[PDB]
Structure formats: structure tokens, C-alpha cells
Amino acid sequence: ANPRENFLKCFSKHIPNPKLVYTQHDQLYMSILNSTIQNLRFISDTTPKPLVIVTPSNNSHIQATILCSKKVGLQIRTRSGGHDAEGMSYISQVPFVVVDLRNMHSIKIDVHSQTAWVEAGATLGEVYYWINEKNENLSFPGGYCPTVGVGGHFSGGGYGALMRNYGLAADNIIDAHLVNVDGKVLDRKSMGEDLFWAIRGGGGENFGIIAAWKIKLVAVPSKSTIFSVKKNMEIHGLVKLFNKWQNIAYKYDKDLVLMTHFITKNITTTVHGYFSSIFHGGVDSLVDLMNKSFPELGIKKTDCKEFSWIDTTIFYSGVVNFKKEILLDRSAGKKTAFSIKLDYVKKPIPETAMVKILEKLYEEDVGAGMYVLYPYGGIMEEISESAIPFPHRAGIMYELWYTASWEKQEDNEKHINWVRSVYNFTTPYVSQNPRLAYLNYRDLDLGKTNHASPNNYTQARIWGEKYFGKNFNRLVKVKTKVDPNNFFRNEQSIPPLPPHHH
Ligand SMILES: *Cc1cc2c(nc3c(=O)[nH]c(=O)nc-3n2C[C@H](O)[C@H](O)[C@H](O)COP(=O)(O)OP(=O)(O)OC[C@H]2O[C@@H](n3cnc4c(N)ncnc43)[C@H](O)[C@@H]2O)c(*)c1C
Ligand SMILES: *[C@@H]1O[C@H](CO)[C@@H](O)[C@H](O)[C@H]1NC(C)=O
Ligand SMILES: *[C@@H]1O[C@H](CO)[C@@H](O)[C@H](O)[C@H]1NC(C)=O
Ligand SMILES: *[C@@H]1O[C@H](CO)[C@@H](O)[C@H](O)[C@H]1NC(C)=O
Ligand SMILES: *[C@@H]1O[C@H](CO)[C@@H](O)[C@H](O)[C@H]1NC(C)=O
Ligand SMILES: *[C@@H]1O[C@H](CO)[C@@H](O)[C@H](O)[C@H]1NC(C)=O
Ligand SMILES: *[C@@H]1O[C@H](CO)[C@@H](O)[C@H](O)[C@H]1NC(C)=O
């Protein structure tokens, strides 16, 4: 009796006769494993590999895997788009199998009722595309990156351009299909409201394997206006603009998103701020708005085109500059090694301190580090904190991402340490009790939950409280109820409650 072969037998038993199981012996193993590992940082020979990969195409397949891993004693890591910031969807410390959902990417739109059934392995890109094909004036609220998978994205909250208008993708989910620790398939009805609440932004990896979402589509203007302007002046003049942006961006009506980037340019060199818009409306209203609200930014008509939504979608994603069918292409953009961390901001950062933050970009190579800033007003002020597990709503001015991408496996420690040091540095200026963070940018630095350690609950709280709010209690309530033996677990997952505290 050994687990790989015992698994495979059990699986065959539950399901006789495409390929659904891969082992190291299969020619395709490696390139499947590899295909969707998004962060090159976790591609080494040292990196643990699973005993089996399964690629289900049917709820029945998922039930079997869950059942068989339960029996033989393997751990599951589900991979949907593979974008985990920490590789947590494809690495484990213990013998494990990855459940790659790439074969379950069906997307079924009901144009009239304005809903859609999207399977767990589809990618934003696809969702965007196929919605737009059915109707140019429709879409869905979600991240910017087309290759993000909907399993990780939605169950983690997930948001982007439409955030200020409609909220997080998790805010717009009507139903789902989920398989639990007992291998049952559950709709919302049968799931019950606690579990339906939980999977919407509490991390699906804590409760089960989601198989499908039901999605409610949102209205989207047939023309939006985009400018995106370069600003490489002297460092102080730059922050003078930043400070202004900081106090107003979140204040616009719902129809303006104004975001900002920072990086270094000129290879051997100066800090550059880019300021970008999605404006639901025309060129002139927009210039007028800008000319009124933010003169010093000095945008002009010459500065901005008006695009269709899907074009805007494209403009604002990881692909150079063409045609809209890239949205469909699993292997677009370039994969890099990356480290990212994100802060939320409630109170304007002091101009002095900000130069210092910007000053730090000089300490890595040109283009390596980058700060992304997105504003936080509009609808987020009216959505309750416990509406869903994701609790970051009212009184946030904007969010700050600090990110580094590189190529080379040696330069790892160097680069992740930079990201940390900027994080450490900004600590006085960002949110505070507690320092809020975002489940979809997992940060093991916030604390780890170990395989080889007894499960202290008050330990998990430290980070549980950062990712979620007051929401954390209800979350551990749901865990304890639906997966009391903590079968669905990872290096930073919600623990159940031990039974003497039941
Ligand atoms: C790589 C990348 C990520 C981005 C980018 N832009 C984002 C943005 O603009 N807004 C955001 O809110 N998030 C952005 N993200 C990050 C993604 O939101 C997160 O990285 C998601 O968690 C990624 O989801 P996914 O693409 O599926 O990657 P996986 O590694 O497979 O991570 C999934 C995560 O959750 C578990 N899981 C996935 N699917 C399921 C199902 N069906 N059931 C249970 N659990 C599931 C996995 O185990 C893993 O833990 C821009 C870029 C470039
Ligand atoms: C795994 O990924 C790395 C970089 O993408 C690459 O060197 C290697 O060829 C990949 N594995 C394959 C093709 O089996
Ligand atoms: C899921 O379960 C079985 C196994 O193949 C099949 O009868 C059913 O139609 C499947 N549904 C799909 C592939 O949509
Ligand atoms: C979408 O919106 C515009 C703005 O009113 C309208 O003129 C256009 O005809 C619409 N088309 C569809 C297919 O909904
Ligand atoms: C911006 O405002 C000034 C008036 O102070 C004006 O001269 C300029 O033409 C305005 N912009 C547009 C687009 O008209
Ligand atoms: C960041 O802060 C933590 C906690 O105080 C510390 O352990 C770590 O070394 C710091 N990282 C730096 C200074 O880069
Ligand atoms: C959880 O609580 C205990 C008991 O008071 C504490 O001492 C310990 O540090 C925590 N447990 C673990 C495993 O870290």
C-alpha cells in the first residue's frame, strides 16, 4: 500500500474511462505543472512537486479527488489561474496533489436575465471577452489581469476598474457550486448562507473546491475616456502632484477612476509618475472636470481617447501597447519572478515621507520596483463591512501596492527584501489598528500556520484580523462547522476551533 498508486486506483474506482490524472511518468506532467505557475520565484528543482496532478472536467471528478485524498492521506492544493503571490496553489510541504481546473472553464451567459454561470477554471480575460461578445454594454467587476483565474480571484474578493461603481467581484456573486470535505456538491441553497458568505472573499482554499460561480453582470458605458500621462520632473514637484491626487482621487463621482503608478526610467535615471483615468463619459466633460478639479495635472484634449469597455479592459492589463482576442489567450503577458505587498491608506501621507518612499525606487534596478496606487471612494462607502468576508470599505482614501519583478533566481532574496524594507518603512503612514491587508495578495510575512505545530487559534487571529475584519470570528465558525478536521489547509489558512472550545 503506497499513496500515489493507491490514490490512482481509488480514483479509477470512483471513475472508470480524456486524461484526468498525471504523474511524473507522464510526458506532460512538467509542462502542465509549470504551465500556469505565474511567479517564476517558485520554479526551482528544489520546489516540491505533487504526486499527482488531476485536471477534472466534471463535478464528479472533484468529488473523487477529495474523497481519494482523504482516504490515502494526500493533501489538496487547487489551482485555477495559478497567480498566488506565494505559490500556495501548487506547492506543499507534505505529499500532495494539485487539482488543476483548466478543463472546467465553461462560461454560459444569459443575455436577458444578465447572469452567467462561470466554471472555476475560467480566467477574467475569458469572462470579459465572452460577456462583451454577447453585449458591448455589459461586463463584470474584477481584476485588471486577464490571466487571473476566477477560483482564486473571486473567492478572495477580487477587484479593479469597476470597484468604485459596483464593488468586488465577490460582491456580485449570486450562487456557486462547491464541493466540501465529504465530497458533496453544493449550490447556495444547499450550502446555506454562512458557507455562501464564507466563500465570497474568505478564500475558497479554506472551505473546499469551488466548481462554478453564478455571476450577475453589470452595466458598462459604450465609451469611456482614458488618458495616461507621464510625469518625470524633479522629485519634489512630483510629490506636489501626488499630494494633490491623494486628497482628491477618492472624492470624484463614481464615473472617474484616477490611478497612479511610479517607477524608475533611464538605464545605466529619474523617478516617473504616471497618472491614468477611466472616465465613464466623453473627452470634453472629462477635460472640463480635470481643468476644474486638478488643473496642475495639465491634461488636454490631445491627451485622451475614448474607448469601448473591452478596449479599456485591454489598455489596462499586462500586454504591450493589439486586437481584442488576446483576452482569450491563456499564455499572454510575460511571467516574472515577483514579490508584492499592499497597504490601505486612511490619512494623507506626508509629502516629506513620500519623497523618501519614492527615493527608495533608486535602490533597485531601473524598472524593478514599482508602486501602484488606486483610489478608494464611491460605492465602497456604502457596502457594509460584514456584507462579505472582505471588510475594507468605508474611510479608505486609496490602496498602495509595492511590487518588484525580476528574472533571476539568485536575485530573489535581494528583491523580496527590498519589498519588505519599503513595507517596513511605510508602516507609520498606512492603516494602523490593525494594519489591514488583502487576501488576494497573500503575505506569509503576516504569520504562518504550520503543518508541524498544534493549531493555536490566537495565533491565526493576528493575520486573520488583518485580512478580514470583525469578519474573522464568523469565518472560524464556518471553518469549524464545515471542515472540523482541517483537511483544506495551507501555510496560512483559517484553523478550525479545537473541540474542547466547541
Ligand atoms: C498574478 C496576478 C495577480 C493579480 C493581478 N491583478 C489583480 C488585481 O488587479 N486585483 C486583484 O484583486 N487581484 C489581482 N491579482 C491577484 C489575484 O486576485 C490573486 O492572485 C488570486 O488569488 C489568484 O487567483 P488564481 O488566478 O486562481 O491563482 P491560484 O494560484 O490558482 O490561486 C488561487 C488561490 O485560491 C485557491 N483556489 C483557486 N481556485 C479555487 C477553487 N476553485 N476552490 C477552492 N480554492 C481555490 C488556490 O488554492 C490558491 O490558494 C495581476 C497578476 C499578474
Ligand atoms: C518550466 O519553466 C521554466 C521557465 O518557464 C523553463 O525553464 C522550463 O523549460 C519549464 N518546463 C518545461 C518546458 O517542461
Ligand atoms: C458530470 O458527471 C458525469 C461524468 O462524466 C456526466 O454524466 C455529467 O454529464 C457530467 N457533466 C458535465 C461534463 O458537464
Ligand atoms: C449601448 O449604449 C449606447 C449609448 O446609449 C447606445 O447608443 C448603443 O446603441 C448601445 N448598444 C447596445 C447593443 O446595447
Ligand atoms: C483650462 O482653463 C483655462 C482657464 O483658466 C483655459 O484657458 C483653458 O483653455 C482651459 N481648458 C479647456 C479644455 O478649455
Ligand atoms: C520588518 O519588520 C519585522 C518585524 O519587526 C522584522 O522582523 C524584519 O526584519 C523587518 N524587515 C526589514 C527591516 O527589512
Ligand atoms: C497559543 O497559546 C498558548 C497558551 O497560552 C501560547 O503560550 C502559545 O504561544 C500559542 N501556541 C502556539 C502553538 O504557538
Swiss-Prot record:
Predominant subcellular localization, coarse grouping: secreted
Name of the molecule in the record: Tetrahydrocannabinolic acid synthase
Tissue: Expressed in the secretory cells of glandular trichomes.
Note in the entry: THCA synthase might contribute to the self-defense of Cannabis plants by producing both THCA and hydrogen peroxide, but since these reaction products are toxic to the plant itself, THCA synthase must be secreted from secretory cells into the storage cavity to avoid cellular damage.
Sites where a glycan is attached: N34, N58, N137, N266, N291, N424, N456
Gene name, Swiss-Prot/TrEMBL: THCAS
Molecular function via GO: delta9-tetrahydrocannabinolate synthase activity; FAD binding
Gene3D superfamilies from the UniProt entry: 3.30.465.10, 3.40.462.20, Uridine Diphospho-n-acetylenolpyruvylglucosamine Reductase, domain 2
Superkingdom classification of source: Eukaryota
Post-translation changes: Glycosylated when produced in a heterologous system. The deglycosylated THCA synthase has more catalytic activity than the glycosylated form. The FAD cofactor is bound via a bicovalent 6-S-cysteinyl, 8alpha-N1-histidyl FAD linkage.
Known function: Oxidoreductase involved in the biosynthesis of cannabinoids-related terpenophenolic natural products, which have pharmacological activity. Catalyzes the oxidative cyclization of the monoterpene moiety in cannabigerolic acid (CBGA), producing delta(9)-tetrahydrocannabinolate (THCA), the major cannabioid in drug-type Cannabis plants. Can also use cannabinerolic acid as substrate, but not cannabigerol or cannabinerol.
Documented effect of changing E399Q: Slightly reduced catalytic activity
Location(s), subcellular: Secreted; Secreted, Extracellular space, Apoplast
One matching Pfam family: BBE
One cellular-component annotation, GO: apoplast
